[PDB]
Structures are given as C-alpha cells and as structure tokens.
C-alpha cells in the first residue's frame, strides 16, 4: 500500500519538481522572510524557528512576538496579521541559505 498523503507538498511556481527539491537539498538550511517597504526582510533566529516548527507540528497558523506586538503567522496563505484584524495582512515566505565563501578556509596555522 501507498498514498500521495505519505509525503510533503510545495506551493506553486514556474519551475519543476526537480528544481525546488535541488534548491533545498543542495544546502539543507532554511530562513523565513516578510515584505517590508523596500523588499523581503529576514526574521530573527529566535522567531523563524517557531514558524518552521508550526508546519512541522501540523497547525495551519502560529503566533510570535516582535518589537512591541503579537503577530499571527498564517501558514495556509503565507501571511501575518494582528490578533484583532481579520482583513488587513502582510506577506511572508520560506527560503534557503546558499552559504558565503567565508564558510571555506585553511588550517588554524595560516
């Protein structure tokens, strides 16, 4: 016996199933982002680990604290909003780190 429900599934794209998997498995890292004024900006490692655990637990939305506010992170539509707000919402996403050249170096003697 077997099923398509025995594995994970990704959001839509213009790429292929062998591209999305390769972008992830080529490093095995992860990060979360949200749309600010000038583009996508990364969450704190304190915070993004809570978002990363929520889709792994099975919940459809989780909660997080910031500079002075509680934001509800919805995993279904990939957005954030305040607990009292039903309509107005800001975009979030998952992404992967590629690692800089600073990750490669010689022996401790030089």
Contact, 92 vs 105, CB < 8 A?
no
Smallest separation (angstroms) from ligand ATP to the CB of 99 = 24
* Minimum distance, C-beta of residue 109 to ligand ATP, in the bound complex (Å): 43
Q: Which of 27, 21, 26, 64 is nearest to 46 (CA)?
A: 64
| Residues of this chain that bind ligand ATP (CB under 6 A) | 34, 37, 66-67, 69, 71, 80, 90
Give the nearer residue to ligand ATP in terms of CB position, either 54 or 80: 80
- 52: number of Cβ within 10 Å: 15
Annotated binding site for a glycoprotein: 34, 37, 41, 71, 80, 90, 102
């Amino acid at each position: 016996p077997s099923s398509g429900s025995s594995g994970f599934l990704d959001k839509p794209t213009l790429l292929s199933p062998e591209e999305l998997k390769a972008a992830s498995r080529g490093n095995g890292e992860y990060a979360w982002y949200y749309e600010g004024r000038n583009g996508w900006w990364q969450y704190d490692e304190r915070t993004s680990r809570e978002l990363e655990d929520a889709f792994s637990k099975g919940k459809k939305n989780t909660e997080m604290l910031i500079a002075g506010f509680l934001y509800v992170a919805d995993l279904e539509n990939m957005v954030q909003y305040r607990r009292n707000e039903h309509g107005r919402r800001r975009k979030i996403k998952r992404d992967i780190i590629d690692i800089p050249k600073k990750g490669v170096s010689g022996p401790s003697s030089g």
